[PDB]
Structure formats: C-alpha cells, structure tokens
Design a protein around this ligand. Sequence first.
Ligand code: NAG
Lengths: 49, 38
Amino acid sequence: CSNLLLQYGSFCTQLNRALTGIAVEQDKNTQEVFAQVKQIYKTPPIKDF
Amino acid sequence: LIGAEHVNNSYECDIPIGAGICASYQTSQSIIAYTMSL
Ligand SMILES: *[C@@H]1O[C@H](CO)[C@@H](O)[C@H](O)[C@H]1NC(C)=O
C-alpha cells in the first residue's frame, strides 16, 4: 500500500499541512482572546467591595 | 522530550510545545524545558 502512495504523496503533503494549519490556528485563537494582559493581577484579600 | 533538561523555574517561553510547557535555549548554555510564565 505504501508503494502506491508515492503517486499521491503531494495530496498528503497538502492534507498534513492543512491539519497543521488548523492546529496552529486553534492554538493561537486562545492567545488572541485570553492573553490580552501581560501581567497577572492577584485578588486582594479584602473582600469589602 | 529527550535532549532538553527540565528546570523548575518559570520564564516566558518562545517555542510552544503543548500542555503548558515550552522549550527554550538559555544558560555553558543548553536547551531547557519549563512551564511557561503567564
Ligand atoms: C525545584 O524546586 C522545588 C522546590 O521544592 C523542588 O521540589 C524541585 O525538586 C526542584 N526541581 C529541580 C529540577 O531541581
């Protein structure tokens, strides 16, 4: 089965790069939303708001 | 992960890996892996 795959190796290069493109796109989607601030703010111990 | 030692301190990471841990080249100097700093 692998010998006949060389005739369609260019197809699998497109598909592997597509899923790699999806995976990096899904990864950067979280940083584009949750990672807006570079500093982490600690909740003050006083809860009198 | 093989070829990169693990260090308990946390810095800002540049090369993402997954599951909250990255890899970077810091201090000679060698490739280290650490949990990313938010
Ligand atoms: C990092 O420091 C913690 C502090 O207790 C220690 O438990 C841990 O073993 C240290 N890790 C390394 C790789 O030295």
